[PDB]
């Protein structure tokens, strides 16, 4: 496809807006706060192997990407058009929101001061990941694992057997491009499973960091006067393959630990994205 | 006026502003006493925990809030709008946190000695000018916590009903405008990114229980306010908002560790220019 | 006075002064006696603790104050005044830091042993170039520390009346200004942003009770002094006022844990012109 | 090529070439069993500790080691050379450290709770391009060490002589090359910064036991090639060069707490184009 | 003194390169790994104060700068040698990565788990100057005791005992760094006040078990020309490099007796010929 001239002239610029709650483990229902929709925001208790053989882990365990696709208004009334108009995503202003809810240290986690009960309920701390991409088709993963032996569930996630049908191999700890995959759906993908596939991701910009251990204090900026470019080196953004726009992110902020047999719960945090999008001349 | 003309120019076109926003951890001003409360200021009370997994209720006064102020411009009227150009913000006092010499729990405390433990933990930094309030959206941490009814701004004061549980995630229905100053929780209400057009507002956090306090501090540096256009909060009917919250983290006392949040005060400096609008 | 114009040109229109500020922890110049007290030169004497939560009277050598020196420019005379254009900073010494056989609290506390645990904690760097003493505003941990009344400069010697809770916070009544060398502490007094017109300061704080020192020093780095117009603190009867406190953290004795603050000293090498002024 | 001339225009004068180096920490690839020694892939091999001052036998599958690979350019032949101009970079696979639902050494000892702990510790990030292998400098910890002598180039496989003490510091005579994967151990071999004229690398080490892993990824960042000239690695007989080895710290099992090193697989991808040489 | 033009034509510009091994207390020689050798690149074992007023350190574990004097090509209006810029670079942390030999164990419980990498108090200096880096001394604690001979002390300079004032700055107590593996980083600082002559560039990070950073690159350039454009000038062609590289200690089994651990520093400096009046 060749990119030519910037489209001008009226509605030639567009802004659209979303949110994307994150996808620790605990679904959206049921909405009581007796029957588990306490733990929405959060995964559920996290569940540990029983042997070197033996590791499997719940669905509702496991954080997974969120993603939303966003339809565009239609530019092209005939596609057989020698030269044809595309939506070009130009920049990003994104924010994690509600940092400041971290600041609750008066609830029933494990305290502080362990010897009488006391001192503050633990806040969030430990491993925090923090992804988003943009893009004008799915984002393209890349399988790899730390253990190819884990037993993930066959229904509720798709994990590296979803799609090649087979077991995982010990290639799958390290770089096997044969576990392959796109994100497609919301809420399904694990993230300890699957990454950004920089092989691809031709029309996709991601920006990724990982910081881990177990007690790291979690770090987060906000403001809304920060642009974010996605244009790349040829002054080309991402091109809105049927006027679809994919937005995907993680965003793991650590883990709450409760008085019950130090049982931690991931915490995600929800991620707003405002993007910048004209109309490009392509052949 | 929305349509964004030429600079004003002429004798007066130009002011500069300046104001402090005191903290509010939860301690208020008044009583002044420092033996009946005050003794508190700048710090919130001792932090009360949740007595089991469905009963959490924090007192007012253990929760740290927005500070806010609405100073009133020089009076205007094609009409004329005042503009925030820029502003220069400091946090001040932070050297006060040097004072290891207090009662509070020693670094050794076998022998009750070393040095009185400083100022350690979560952080919090955000400010915001605008030409309108801050746009607040609500979150929490567990949508069962039991604010109390009155003496704060809580979800239920908006909606009147019972959170849900979408407040621990991003419920577009859970909004506030930051209107009143020590009255809106900052573990509840944060900046709205979907709003504040006409603000502008920068945030950091800084989690964990014993994180060291870092700050720097200058009158050498300045935040522009205009946006991508060139263009910076517009002032409705001469009114200019500022908004913060600065948390150093916790003292922690001799007696079952009781925590106080430890908050400091900001000063603003803002710059500000006539504009022509439409 | 107040209206600047052209820099002046010709024979000795600018000059380049040089000054070494050394640190103010507590412990005096004098004695000089490595067995009267001189071998804490550079040093707090033992941080003394409250008594309880409404008795901290803490030892005027165990709270470190502010460095300041006013050096005298070239004598001058429309008028001309001496206008700071630069500096070049460097705190000297941080490689002594690196003295770990000494005998402090060793890192194996079982068997004695292990090495001499390293100046750790606490760390507060705040320099500052003007044309007239910084001005400083007042704010404190706690108003009801009773500070000694001679020897020192604390807000009751300003205000002649005790602190108020409000001192805890921005109070805008708690101001002085930096004119002596070592009798301002610290942790009482801090730059005041909304003075300061003619001075430049840049200060950091970080936390903690062992946390690592950083330092960094270079011959290579020079600090612009330079308005948002272009113009340096202009100095008044051509006198220019350098202040700093550069605190590196704490030792800590083999004897419960008693605490020493340890400073370093600043280097200044400050280049001025000369500036036409109305 | 010593000459370098004016870049080449026309058809096929640009190529861009992409390659992913898995790391070799220690397991090799084969036997593939995941009950066999395969479920290891990625991973080094428990960590054999010395049994005395002077009795230090590292087992091969221990020593992470130099990933590197050749790749072949599109043929060629005033000559024309390949030149290397930028590469995007990128390790992939940081979200796998998230996984804490295994058997490792969990978080609460006393009571065998919590998490399996994730991978911490020291951390070694280490990349290159060139149009010939990368020159190698020998140094070690301890000279004493008895490095297998099948399985692994040590200094002694390039001297044929055992180790002496100048291979603690720098000691010119321990060079060799990069010319083959999974084979020159990490902790003997570094970037000889007194060749590699036609190579680029660049490096970070971060040590520690318990050290939080850090990471950062985006397909948005180019890594320029060109030096100080403008010019690029020139591909000798149309051979470039890719090296890398990337670290993230250690597992511990609940076993002895036994460590395996991890490390991930590095994507690149490089755009070259033709130079005029002569 | 008065600067003047650059001087074009042949061999105008030359470029020179060292390396220089770390000084941390154990000399290059005896060779023999049986008979201290295998402390190189290493201190001695670190020996404490035995009283507050009884601190005699051995010379063996005290690290002291590393410095070498280059010989430039022959020159002689007069010419002078200008040092335009410099690659430097500490080669070997890799070798950190050594967690399989006998330092006291991560599992001191049941003396398992890794061998304890380097950690704690790091330092790193590097100078490139036309005359030897000014040094100013500043110690810790005037009342120590170091040896008269082996090392270059205050006392070395003064003749006299430390003063109270050599715990700050004392302009008296000055020297030159003239001698490689004499001067120890613990006592003497660049001098601020002097050096007009060449750069030097520092960096101190404490505390006893601070994990060690380190970075290296061959795309680095360090620029050496001052706010007027003049690179260090070199006084009859000798060209002065100076540096100190300290990534922490390494601990053994014994009593936890620490060992600093330094690393080795490549330089490559260009210079060019500089017309001078
Ligand atoms: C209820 C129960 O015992 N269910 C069994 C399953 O165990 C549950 O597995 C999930 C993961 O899928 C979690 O580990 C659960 O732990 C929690 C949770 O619900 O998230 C952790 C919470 O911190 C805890 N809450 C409180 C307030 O203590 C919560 C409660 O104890 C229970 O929800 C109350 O019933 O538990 C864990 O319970 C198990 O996966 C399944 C398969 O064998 O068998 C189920 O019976
Ligand atoms: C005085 C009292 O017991 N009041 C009861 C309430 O308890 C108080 O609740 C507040 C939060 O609203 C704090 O946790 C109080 O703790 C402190 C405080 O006043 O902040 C913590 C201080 O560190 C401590 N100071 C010292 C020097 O010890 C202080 C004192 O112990 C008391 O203030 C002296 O009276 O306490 C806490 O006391 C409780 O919330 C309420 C239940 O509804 O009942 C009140 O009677
Ligand atoms: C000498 C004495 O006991 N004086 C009493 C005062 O106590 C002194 O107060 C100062 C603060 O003003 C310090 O805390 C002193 O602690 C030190 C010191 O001199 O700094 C701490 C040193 O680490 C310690 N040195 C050694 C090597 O042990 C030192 C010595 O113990 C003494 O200096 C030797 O005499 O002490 C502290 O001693 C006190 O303020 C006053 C009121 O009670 O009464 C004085 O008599
Ligand atoms: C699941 C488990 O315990 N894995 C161990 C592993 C097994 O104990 C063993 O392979 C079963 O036969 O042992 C590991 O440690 C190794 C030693 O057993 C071997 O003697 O030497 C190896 C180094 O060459 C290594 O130290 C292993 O196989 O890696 C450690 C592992 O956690
Ligand atoms: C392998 C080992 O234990 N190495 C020790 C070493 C030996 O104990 C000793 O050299 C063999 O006799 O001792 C070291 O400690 C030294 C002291 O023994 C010596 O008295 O003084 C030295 C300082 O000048 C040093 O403290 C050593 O030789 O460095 C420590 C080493 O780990």
């Not at 001008?8 to 610029?13: A, E």
């Not at 569940?47 to 033996?54: C, F, M, Q, R």
């Given at each position: 496809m060749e990119v030519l001239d910037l489209v001008?002239?009226?509605?030639?610029?567009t802004e659209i807006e979303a949110f994307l709650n994150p996808r620790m483990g605990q679904p959206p229902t049921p909405e009581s706060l007796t029957e588990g929709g306490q733990y929405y925001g959060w995964s559920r208790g996290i569940?540990?192997?029983?042997?070197?053989?033996?590791d499997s882990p719940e669905n509702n365990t496991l954080p997974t990407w969120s993603?939303?696709?966003?339809?565009?208004?239609?530019?092209?009334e005939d596609l057989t058009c020698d030269t044809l108009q595309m939506w070009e995503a130009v920049s990003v202003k994104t924010e994690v929101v509600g940092s400041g809810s971290?600041?609750?240290?008066?609830?029933?986690?494990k305290p502080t001061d362990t010897v009488?009960?006391?001192g503050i309920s633990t806040p969030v701390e430990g491993s925090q990941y923090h992804v988003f991409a943009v893009g004008?088709?799915?984002?393209?993963?890349?399988?790899?694992?730390?253990?190819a032996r884990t037993k993930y569930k066959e229904e509720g996630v798709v994990t590296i057997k979803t799609i090649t049908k087979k077991d995982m191999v010990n290639k799958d700890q390290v770089l096997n491009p044969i576990s392959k995959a796109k994100l497609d759906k919301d809420g399904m993908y694990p993230v300890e499973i699957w990454h950004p596939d920089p092989a691809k991701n031709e029309n996709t910009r991601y920006f990724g960091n990982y910081t881990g251990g177990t007690t790291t204090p979690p770090v987060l900026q906000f403001t809304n006067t920060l642009t974010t470019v996605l244009l790349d080196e040829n002054g080309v953004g991402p091109l809105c393959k049927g006027?679809?726009?994919?937005?995907?992110?993680?965003?793991?902020?650590?883990w709450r630990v409760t008085r019950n047999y130090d049982v931690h719960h991931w915490r995600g945090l929800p991620r707003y994205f405002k993007i910048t999008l004209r109309k490009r001349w392509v052949k």
């Open positions: 001008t002239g009226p509605d030639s610029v569940n540990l192997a029983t042997s070197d053989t033996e993603m939303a696709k966003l339809q565009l208004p239609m530019l092209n971290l600041l609750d240290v008066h609830g029933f986690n009488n009960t006391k004008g088709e799915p984002l393209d993963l890349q399988g790899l694992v730390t253990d006027e679809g726009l994919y937005l995907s992110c993680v965003d793991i902020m650590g």
